[PDB]
Structures are given as structure tokens and as C-alpha cells.
């Protein structure tokens with residue numbers, strides 16, 4: 001039950017306008033053969049160019065929408081479009097490049113995939129809405145064979161050079177001319193009615209059709225993400241560490257404790273309404289307050305409506321005390337809220353482009369997140385950076401410039417000189433805070449929140 005059997009049937013109806021007369025009865029084995037590749041009855045870690053939905057989902061970071069359009073098949077020029085927004089024209093002799101032979105076009109394809117993918121994935125998965133020219137163009141830029149390692153490192157080989165006769169990963173591929181052992185999935189096999197645009201546009205108003213190859217490539221990946229991450233959701237699937245995942249997650253826990261601890265001290269709310277993850281734990285276990293939890297899974301599609309979360313009749317009175325929405329995305333937060341909200345527009349290795357302005361945030365698990373909307377925050381203000389500690393001034397166990405900051409809220413700074421302990425802790429917390437913000441989290445708070453109110457929590 002692991003890999004896609006090459007003896008699985010492939011539905012050819014999508015193929016029959018580029019490839020008239022194609023047999024209705026078709027396996028992966030016969031299709032790969034028709035595409036001009038030979039798998040040589042090879043048991044060497046590459047059983048099929050094509051993969052299961054499940055396998056594609058585990059390799060979402062590798063997804064590159066790919067589409068080819070007839071420009072006038074060997075007679076005529078082809079437009080190659082990638083979900084990176086690139087269009088290359090290959091002659092057989094939004095970025096839009098003039099007509100060039102395959103021997104140069106293939107170099108550009110390797111450079112482009114290597115730069116997109118080297119910090120994302122060990123592979124490429126070409127996401128297709130297959131009509132035929134895309135599959136019959138692969139022979140011109142793809143080589144297959146046994147699984148190999150990079151010539152300069154231990155990573156699996158993703159590229160081949162005809163010049164040097166060697167194999168490279170995405171990091172070591174400069175001057176390489178062939179994509180090696182790519183994977184691919186035809187979204188049209190999943191059983192849809194009507195064309196790509198009609199199916200995409202059911203779910204997404206953000207990706208237009210300019211009637212160019214890259215636009216279909218983008219719509220194809222978008223539809224695929226919608227199907228595997230919006231309508232369907234699987235939070236069991238783990239994803240490898242590729243960047244600052246652990247630091248960001250640690251940072252998110254340190255900021256959450258800091259901000260909620262401070263709001264309770266500053267405004268002394270008698271009740272806190274903790275709305276979101278049903279696994280959620282008290283972030284300030286020592287606080288006096290009545291802590292009431294409300295279960296909401298991460299909304300992958302549309303932001304929750306505050307009307308459905310709160311009304312239908314709890315403490316019932318959510319207007320009493322404060323509401324904590326820690327990555328619980330709602331259309332409009334009430335005035336008495338503390339909020340962490342992921343900004344889908346952030347550029348990072350963890351954040352993949354998503355469906356209808358939303359983004360696919362992949363950090364241990366994959367969370368499709370609805371488009372960031374500034375109007376959600378009209379009743380709140382941005383939470384300013386600050387560090388608060390009531391811990392004793394007391395070193396123990398670090399090289400130093402003395403800290404001066406208006407935003408180091410400690411007994412020692414009240415006293416006019418920040419102690420070494422609170423200086424070290426301030427600097428660690430500011431680093432954590434910067435990490436979290438740079439990762440794309442944004443923090444919002446009730447308008448009355450004032451750090452001036454924390455100074456009297458020591459006297």
C-alpha cells in the first residue's frame with residue numbers, strides 16, 4: 001500500500017484533444033512508455049514517475065504546478081508554465097520569455113526549480129491538469145534512473161549534467177541541464193466535471209486566467225491545495241524540520257505566557273475565555289483568574305464568524321473579562337480580546353502559497369490559513385513589544401553591555417539600573433519575539449492595554 005502501482009489505470013479522456021486516438025484502457029506503465037521513458041523492471045527506489053495523493057500530501061513542499069500550451073508538438077513552439085509564474089517558450093528548431101531551443105530551456109528549468117526548492121524539499125512534484133503536451137514535453141528536460149546521491153553531498157540527486165556526466169541535489173545543481181527522477185500527479189485523475197478554470201473558480205477569486213501557461217499551472221496547484229488541505233485536513237501527517245520550526249514554536253509559547261500574564265496583572269480580569277485549540281493548556285498556570293476553554297479547530301477555509309462562536313447562547317457573557325484568540329482566526333474580534341493571528345502574506349520557507357489568498361503554513365503539521373484581513377482587528381490595536389518580569393534580580397551560573405530600555409519592565413529598571421539577569425532575559429525574549437514576528441505572527445490587544453499599569457505590580 002506504499003507507492004502507486006504502474007499497473008494502476010490512468011483515465012485518458014483529458015489527454016485525447018492533444019493526443020487523438022489515445023486508448024481508453026491505459027496503465028501508468030503504458031503512459032510512461034508513451035512519454036518516451038523506460039523503467040527497465042527497476043527495483044531501485046523509483047517504481048513510478050507518478051505518485052498517490054497521500055504521497056503528494058507528504059511532499060506538498062515539493063509541489064510545482066506545470067502546464068504546457070501549443071503556441072501555434074515538434075511542428076510548433078510550446079509555452080511551458082510553472083506555478084512560480086514563469087513562462088518559457090521552447091522551439092523544436094507573469095514572466096514571459098522569447099522562443100529558444102530545448103538545450104537552453106532545460107538549463108533554465110533546472111536553475112528555476114533548484115532556487116525554488118533547495119530550502120523546501122529533497123524533490124519536485126509536478127502538479128498537472130494533464131491534456132497531453134505537458135507529458136510529451138518531459139522527455140526534453142527529464143532523465144530517470146535509479147535513486148542516486150548528490151556528487152558533492154548526501155542529499156538525493158534531483159538534477160543531472162550531460163556535460164560532466166554527474167548528479168546533484170537542488171543545492172549543487174549550478175550548470176546542470178536535466179531534472180532527474182521528478183515526481184508528478186495528474187489532478188484530473190481525482191474525478192472532476194468540467195475544465196480547470198470552472199473547478200478552480202468554485203474555490204478561489206485570487207488567481208485570474210490570463211490564458212497563459214503559468215496561470216493554469218498556478219490554478220492547478222491552487223485546486224490541488226484546496227482538495228488536500230482546505231476541504232480535506234490531516235493534522236496527523238508530520239513534515240520534516242527545514243528551518244527555525246523549533247525556535248519559532250518555543251518563541252510562540254514564551255510570548256503567549258508573557259502577554260497574557262501581563263494583561264491579567266495590568267487589568268485584573270476576573271474571567272478569561274480561551275477560544276481555539278481543544279488541546280490548549282493554561283498559558284499562565286499561576287494566574288488567579290477563572291479560566292474557561294472553548295473548543296475550535298484551526299479553520300482552514302473561511303475565518304470563523306464571531307456570531308457562530310459566541311451566540312447560539314459557556315460563561316455565555318464573553319463580554320465579562322478577556323477573550324484569548326491564540327491562532328483562532330475570526331472575521332471580527334470583540335474589543336476585550338488578546339489575539340495572535342498568522343499573516344498569510346509573509347514570505348518564508350514554512351509558508352507556501354495557498355487557496356483564495358490563504359497560505360499553507362507547514363511547521364511540523366500543515367495548516368491552510370484563511371487570507372489575512374486587517375478589518376478583523378478594528379476593535380483592537382497592535383500590541384507593542386515589552387518584557388515583564390517579577391523574578392528576583394539574581395544572576396547564577398553571557399558577555400555584557402549594560403541594558404537601557406523603557407520596555408524592560410522590572411524592579412531593577414524601576415530602581416533606575418537593569419540587573420544582569422533581567423538584561424540577559426530581556427535580550428533572549430526580544431530575540432524570541434523578533435523570531436515569531438518575522439515568521440509572520442501578528443499580536444493585537446484591547447485598546448485600554450497599557451504597560452504603565454505593570455510598574456505598580458512591584459512597590
Ligand SMILES: COc1ccccc1N1CCN(CC#N)CC1
Nearest residue numbers: 253254256257281282283284285
Ligand atoms: C514559556 O512557557 C511557560 C512558562 C511558564 C509558565 C507557562 C508556560 N507556558 C506557555 C504557554 N503554554 C501553552 C502551550 N503550548 C503553556 C505553558
Ligand SMILES: [Zn+2]
Nearest residue numbers: 150153169172
Ligand atoms: Zn548536494
Ligand SMILES: [Zn+2]
Nearest residue numbers: 204207222356
Ligand atoms: Zn486559486
Ligand SMILES: [Zn+2]
Nearest residue numbers: 393412419422
Ligand atoms: Zn533585575
